[PDB]
């Protein structure tokens, strides 16, 4: 249940 893909990933690798 621990989130393994941090939301910052989507914020930062989207363009």
């Amino acid at each position, epitope marked *: 249940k621990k989130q393994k893909v941090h939301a*910052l990933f989507y914020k*930062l690798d989207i*363009v």
Partner: antibody, heavy 125, light 107 residues
């Protein structure tokens, strides 16, 4: 070995800006995010924000949105943090730190595995 | 927000247990750092329980519900320092540190 080299101590007057630098070596610069963290004298650590040098994208803590700017130079594997309209409350040591994990669609862990030594910034008239 | 005790004392050889608590921890990994005065923090524990290379096994980490705990065994004088937990906000975006725990080694 991963090393992060930070620019020397800064002394500023209230209202000025300061641009700090963090020069990374020993790993692939564009594979990892860089954090900035500050610590006022006697106090605790406070996260300021993060930059992804691959895509040149940033995110800052709510209290620093609007007065921090992080930038990067891949030619020199350097990250910069600019803080504007400095106040006495901005006196602190400013650290940069490499993100502990390589981030992709299958996995992204966000913490700091290697820290720079800190740049002292003193605000005084 | 992350709550850990501001301070804790222990005698040489004893075991220290520093806990950090917040509603968000069941869904977010935590990280533990050691900082000695005038030095850069040092990562002790990541993803709640994993210890980097170079960190001694005296340091271990555990998770339980809304708490995470750093355990130091065989405390030596050189473990006197500030220990910080770090995780992410209820926003799931912004990183937050605990207030830090000053560890005093008695004697």
């Amino acid at each position: 070995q991963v090393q992060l080299v930070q620019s020397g101590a800064e002394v500023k007057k209230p209202g000025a800006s300061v641009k700090l630098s963090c020069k990374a070596s020993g790993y692939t610069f564009t594979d990892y995010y860089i954090h900035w963290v500050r610590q006022a004298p006697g106090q605790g650590l406070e996260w300021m924000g993060i930059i992804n040098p691959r895509r040149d994208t940033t995110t800052y803590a709510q209290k620093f949105q609007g007065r921090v700017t992080m930038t990067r130079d891949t030619s020199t594997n350097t990250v910069y943090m600019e803080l504007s309209s400095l106040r006495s409350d901005d006196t602190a040591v400013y650290f940069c730190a490499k993100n502990v994990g390589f981030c992709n669609s299958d996995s992204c862990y966000v913490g700091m595995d290697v820290w720079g030594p800190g740049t002292t910034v003193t605000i005084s008239s | 927000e992350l709550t850990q005790p501001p301070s804790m004392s222990v005698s040489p050889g004893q075991t220290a247990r520093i806990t950090c608590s917040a509603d968000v921890l069941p869904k977010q990994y935590a990280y533990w750092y050691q900082q000695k005065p005038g030095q850069a923090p040092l990562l002790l524990i990541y993803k709640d329980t994993e210890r980097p290379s170079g960190i001694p096994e005296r340091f271990s980490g555990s998770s339980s519900g809304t708490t995470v705990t750093l355990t130091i065994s065989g405390v030596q004088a050189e473990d006197e320092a500030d220990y910080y937990c770090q995780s992410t906000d209820s926003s799931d975006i912004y990183l937050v540190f605990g207030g830090g725990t000053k560890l005093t080694v008695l004697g």
